A paper describes a structure:
One broad family of bacterial polymorphic toxins gathers multidomain proteins with a modular organization, comprising a C-terminal toxin domain fused to a N-terminal domain that adapts to the delivery apparatus. We recently described and characterized Tre23, a toxin domain fused to a T6SS-associated Rhs protein in Photorhabdus laumondii, Rhs1. Recently, we characterized a new toxin domain associated to a Rhs element in Photorhabdus laumondii. This Rhs1 toxin, encoded by the plu0353 gene, is delivered by the T6SS, through interactions with VgrG (Plu0355) and the Eag chaperone (EagR, Plu0354). Tre23 inhibits protein synthesis through ADP-ribosylation of helix 44 of the ribosomal 23 S RNA, hence preventing protein elongation by blocking the GTPase-associated center.
The Rhs1-EagR complex was purified from E. coli overproducing FLAG-tagged Rhs1 and Strep-tagged EagR by Streptag affinity followed by size-exclusion chromatography. In order to prevent Rhs1 autocleavage, a catalytic-null mutant, D1338N (see below), was used. We then performed an unmasked refinement to 3.72 Å followed by a local refinement on Rhs1Shell and obtained a resolution of 3.17 Å for this region. In the high-resolution cryo-EM densities obtained, we could build de novo an atomic model of Rhs1Shell from amino acids (aa) 272 to 1357. Rhs1Shell is composed of a continuous strip of antiparallel sheets (residues 420-1262) defining a hollow barrel, which is closed on each side by two plugs (residues 272–420 and 1263-1357 respectively). The C-terminal plug is deeply embedded in the Rhs1 β-barrel and tightly closes one side of the barrel. The N-terminal plug caps the other side of the Rhs1 β-barrel but remains at the exterior. It is composed of an Immunoglobulin-like (Ig-like) domain (336–421) preceded by a small extended domain sealing it to the Rhs1 β-barrel. The β-barrel and the two plugs define a central cavity of ~28,000 Å3 in volume. In this cavity, densities are visible but not well resolved, confirming that the C-terminal toxin domain is encapsulated into the Rhs1 β-barrel but suggesting that it is highly flexible and/or partially unfolded.
Author numbering: 272 to 287, 290 to 402, 409 to 927, 943 to 1010, 1027 to 1357
Write the structure that this text describes.
């Protein structure tokens, strides 16, 4: 037939070119406006079609309908038309091959609507001369409109949007469209420009909001070369039948060769690796063969609905349909879980979904049939409200909490009022660019360049930050409020090839030609980090800056089934058909995972521990079983939670938390004690905690949200502190009781020196890579020239020499004094997680055990009888117990609010009779904490308000350099956020890695890789403004202090 099936553009497979036809796919958006319904000028390439922009180019404004007396054809902006049979005996028609569209008869012409959209298109203007009907408007069910106005001689001159926006089209004497201008409330802004070759084919397309592109054509009127005009281009060569055989981009990117045969298309790279398609007579892809092997197969209904998918290992996903509706009723996963759907009879709109656990959700619909909330499985309704224009003005939860929105006369959102009656106010330029935002008495403003990109930001503090974009919209330079410049450079495809710090040091990147994945990083000291890719683009080996290597192997479907490190340790993985990890094999044994029908973990079994979980209804966890204890969460209410810990000398601990309708803790209650009240500001920051007639804490914040003061005590000595900040928001000074400390920083915000009363206490220097290593003094003098081996691995630190393992772990530490004999500290790493495993100091050994999540469970020393056990409530401890000679010394129950300690209870046991009795069981004592921003506890207070413990004096990077005060036994054991102190070794325990304070570094390389950061052994850039709470990736403690160009 003289037709081609319509495809939805998500069912098409591309290389470089549509594999099924050898046809170039180009589709570019040039304008985008409007608030209620969108006004979008989009153009696409279809060589044998015409419209605005001349031969070959067609666009959203030139859609039309044709009617051959009883059949109607709609010419959409895709490569094919829609066909409908509409006799004079019928009001509406549907075609099973594109069942989303319905065509209905109109007053004059036809009306086309897509099921899941509110917008309908009216082809109701006769073109004077099958019969051609022009597009005349779009209309919402809300009677919003977008009107197309034609002059005499049937040119489109204007497009009017009922909100306000309004476009004028302009033509030259040859009728060629040359410009589109926005002509709206005395505006004259030019929105796009077009230029043509002498033959009238489109030569250029300059778009204010988008890109400037150029086009060249071969002698057969087919595209030969498009370019950015600066560094990007792709080149195309064609066969005698119009099909594309070769493509090459700039820089050697995307090199493809295509071979065509009837039913089969194979595409090959310059290396000879070949992908193979198969497709059926409807141009639906049936098999894909990848170059490493592996065959994926698809099977279709007679109307081209996908019914079955088989992955190359045999995972089979099946579907079933409601005969001709095109509506899916069952989806069966490869694990056998069945999902079920049902639809309304009169109109094919979803009335219910059932999941494999027999929970049912019911969608709800307003008048005009637009969604209006849902009924949850519990029977609890959520509702929505809409103004006369269809904009959501109210949303409501079954608790009665509600969120409210208000709209300008141009239907722009101008005020958002949230569930806690905090308000945000917005402001707009005449061109609808977001000009202003008022959030909490802080006012933000922005200015824009001629391409509608942010030029200047004007912060609440009256500071100016400047942005410079290239013509393509890549942020080439950022200038912060100190005038330091951060710069980054872009290559052939807006891939960044280099970036330069404010100190001026430069980094470089290299990309894979076939896939544009990152394959190399060059250090400012010339060291290199590298990936090697498979034929399928999988990473099969990576190599570290120091030259450590890892190797991987994969299965047919793409899962990773083996890892080999450089110590010859082979880790293996087995997966279920849903790609969940199901077994882990290690030199130390198997670990087994078990799941339910829905993907919820029920049991992890491991060489030395077992975890169990139970869930209740809303996928809250209600029980956990761990080694050493249990947790039982009650949840009596939507805004309450009660936790009980049972451990065992049987012990129990209870707490209750209450929440302020927006998720923030506002009260804490410990069983035997009067409650603690937490106050919240309009930004949700904690401004104070108090116990009635007792402890009170008060805190102040700047308009940039940084903490500027703390005061605490028996309000009616405590702590009394102040902070000062730079204009780039680095901390410059801190003071307590007048003892001011001063920090000075280089052009990276790294502390050069610490002065405390004009005396210099500490100073530091940094190398070209940012490692906090070169001459430094905190407690001893560290020299810079013997600090590192080959790749930021430690060589000499004072009188200690370090030896490293073949796998890049630290293996020994040697105190080579030359006056004393050998002192050796030994570490015994395992393989599952580079867990420390064991340690031998100058004498007595110590051993550690871990859970199945990487969370330490024990710490034992058999020689002296010391054991420490831990119970965990998530990413932070819940209970700690400490034993010697088989009896308790201490127990700590701890409550956290984020990474910041809020309260602590402690019982202290001691035998006094020297008889087999656990004597003098003491009384629980509650302490309330005051903490620094980066998570270090500063002081602890009695509920009555008396201070009972105070932090010793401390170095920038954590070294203790004062003495212990009163009550050293009440020290919680916490350092920066996420870390615990090990006094036997002087190491700070992060979850996945161990930190050495004396060297500012971790003992082992990053568990993830370059995702964690470019610096594999560095802890953090600045201990006073960053935290690293898991061992994986550092983050800013305050928002608005983040680097906007990236790092």
């Amino acid at each position: 037939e003289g037709a081609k099936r319509y495809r939805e553009a998500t069912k098409k497979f591309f290389t470089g070119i549509d594999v099924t036809t050898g046809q170039l796919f180009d589709q570019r958006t040039d304008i985008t406006l409007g608030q209620t319904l969108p006004l979008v000028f989009l153009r696409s390439w279809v060589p044998e079609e015409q419209g605005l922009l001349g031969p070959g180019w067609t666009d959203s404004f030139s859609e039309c309908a044709l009617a051959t007396g009883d059949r109607v054809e709609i010419r959409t902006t895709e490569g094919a038309s829609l066909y409908f049979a509409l006799p004079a005996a019928y009001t509406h028609s549907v075609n099973p091959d594109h069942p989303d569209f319905t065509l209905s008869r109109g007053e004059q012409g036809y009306i086309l609507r897509h099921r899941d959209s509110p917008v309908s298109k009216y082809f109701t203007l006769p073109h004077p001369s099958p019969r051609r009907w022009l597009l005349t408007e779009h209309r919402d069910v809300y009677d919003n409109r977008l009107r197309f106005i034609y002059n005499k001689h049937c040119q489109l001159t204007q497009v009017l949007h009922s909100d306000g926006p309004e476009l004028t089209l302009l033509y030259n004497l040859r009728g060629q469209l040359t410009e589109i201008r926005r002509t709206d409330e005395r505006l004259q802004e030019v929105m796009a420009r077009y230029h043509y070759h002498d033959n009238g084919r489109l030569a250029e397309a300059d778009s204010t909001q988008n890109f400037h592109l150029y086009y060249e054509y071969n002698a057969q009127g087919l595209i030969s070369r498009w370019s950015d005009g600066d560094q990007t281009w792709v080149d195309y060569r064609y066969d005698k039948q119009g099909r594309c055989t070769d493509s090459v981009g700039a820089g050697g990117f995307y090199p493809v060769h295509l071979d065509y045969a009837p039913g089969i298309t194979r595409s090959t790279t310059p290396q000879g690796h070949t992908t193979t398609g198969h497709y059926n007579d409807q141009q639906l892809i049936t098999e894909i063969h990848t170059p490493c092997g592996g065959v994926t197969r698809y099977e279709y209904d007679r109307w081209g609905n996908l019914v079955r998918q088989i992955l190359p290992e045999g995972e089979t996903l099946t579907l079933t349909y409601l005969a001709d509706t095109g509506r899916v009723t069952s989806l069966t996963e490869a694990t056998g879980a069945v999902w079920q759907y049902s639809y309304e009879a009169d109109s094919l709109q979803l009335t219910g979904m059932t999941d494999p656990l027999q929970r049912t959700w019911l969608p709800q619909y307003d008048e005009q049939g637009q969604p209006a909330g849902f009924i949850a499985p519990d029977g609890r309704k959520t509702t929505l409200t809409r103004n006369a224009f269809g904009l959501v003005t109210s949303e409501t939860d079954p608790d009665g909490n509600s969120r409210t929105q208000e709209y300008d006369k141009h239907q722009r959102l101008v005020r958002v009022l949230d569930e806690e009656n905090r308000t945000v106010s917005l402001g707009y330029d005449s061109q609808d660019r977001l000009r202003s935002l008022t959030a909490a008495g802080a006012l933000w403003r922005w200015r824009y360049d001629r391409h509608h990109r942010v030029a200047v930001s004007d912060r609440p503090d009256n500071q100016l930050e400047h942005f410079t974009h290239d013509r393509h919209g890549n942020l080439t330079c950022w200038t912060d409020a100190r005038g330091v410049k951060w710069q980054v450079e872009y290559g052939p495809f807006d891939l960044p090839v280099a970036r330069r710090d404010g100190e001026g040091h430069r980094w470089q990147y290299r990309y894979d030609a076939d896939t544009l994945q990152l394959t190399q990083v060059i250090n400012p000291q010339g060291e290199t980090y590298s990936y090697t890719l498979d034929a399928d683009g999988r990473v099969i080996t990576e190599q570290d800056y120091a030259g450590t290597q890892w190797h991987y192997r994969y299965d047919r479907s793409g899962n990773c089934i083996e890892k080999r490190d450089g110590e010859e340790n082979v880790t293996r993985y087995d997966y279920d058909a849903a790609r969940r990890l199901t077994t882990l094999h290690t030199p130390e044994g198997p670990t087994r995972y078990h799941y339910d029908s829905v993907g919820r973990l029920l049991t992890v079994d491991s060489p030395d521990s077992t975890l169990h979980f139970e869930y209740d209804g809303q996928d809250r966890i209600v029980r956990e079983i761990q080694p050493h204890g249990e947790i039982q969460r009650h949840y009596p209410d939507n805004r309450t939670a009660e936790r009980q810990l049972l451990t065992g000398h049987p012990g129990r601990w209870q707490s209750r938390r209450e929440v302020n309708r927006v998720g923030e803790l506002i009260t804490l209650t410990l069983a035997g004690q009067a409650p603690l009240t937490i106050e919240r500001d309009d930004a949700g920051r904690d401004t104070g905690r108090y116990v009635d007639g007792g402890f009170i804490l008060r805190q102040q914040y700047s308009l940039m949200g940084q903490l500027t003061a703390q005061r605490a005590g028996r309000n009616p000595a405590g702590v009394a502190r102040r902070y000062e900040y730079d204009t780039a928001l680095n901390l410059t000074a801190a003071s307590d009781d007048g003892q001011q400390v001063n920090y000075l920083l280089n052009g990276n915000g790294q502390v050069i020196s610490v002065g405390e009363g004009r005396t210099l206490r500490e100073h530091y220097q940094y190398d070209e890579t940012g490692y906090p290593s070169r001459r430094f003094d905190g407690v001893q003098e560290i020299m810079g020239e013997t600090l590192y081996q080959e790749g930021h691995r430690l060589n000499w630190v004072g009188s200690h020499r370090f030896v490293y393992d073949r796998a890049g772990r630290m293996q020994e530490k040697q105190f080579l004094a030359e006056g004393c004999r050998l002192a050796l500290t030994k570490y015994r790493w395992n393989s599952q997680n580079q867990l420390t495993g064991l340690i031998t100091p100058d004498g007595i050994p110590w051993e550690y055990r871990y859970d199945a999540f990487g969370r330490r469970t024990e710490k034992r020393c058999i020689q002296s009888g010391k054991l420490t056990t831990y119970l965990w409530d998530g990413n932070v401890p819940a209970e700690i117990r400490e034993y010697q000679h088989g009896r308790l010394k201490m127990i700590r129950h701890l409550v956290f609010d984020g990474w910041e300690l809020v309260a602590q209870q402690t019982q202290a046991f001691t035998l006094n009779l020297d008889n087999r009795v656990e004597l003098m069981a003491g009384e629980v004592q509650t302490q309330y904490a005051v903490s620094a921003p980066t998570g270090e506890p500063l002081a602890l207070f009695d509920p009555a308000g008396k201070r009972v413990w105070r932090r010793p004096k401390q170095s920038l990077y954590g070294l203790r350099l004062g003495g212990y005060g009163e009550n050293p036994q009440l020290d919680p054991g916490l350092r920066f956020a996420g870390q615990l102190f090990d006094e036997e070794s002087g190491l700070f325990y992060n979850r996945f890695r161990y930190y050495l304070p004396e060297a500012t570094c971790y003992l082992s390389p990053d568990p993830t890789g370059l995702w964690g950061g470019e610096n594999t052994y560095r802890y953090v850039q600045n201990p006073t403004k960053f935290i690293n709470p898991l061992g994986l990736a550092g983050e800013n403690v305050f928002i608005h202090a983040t680097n906007k160009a990236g790092f």
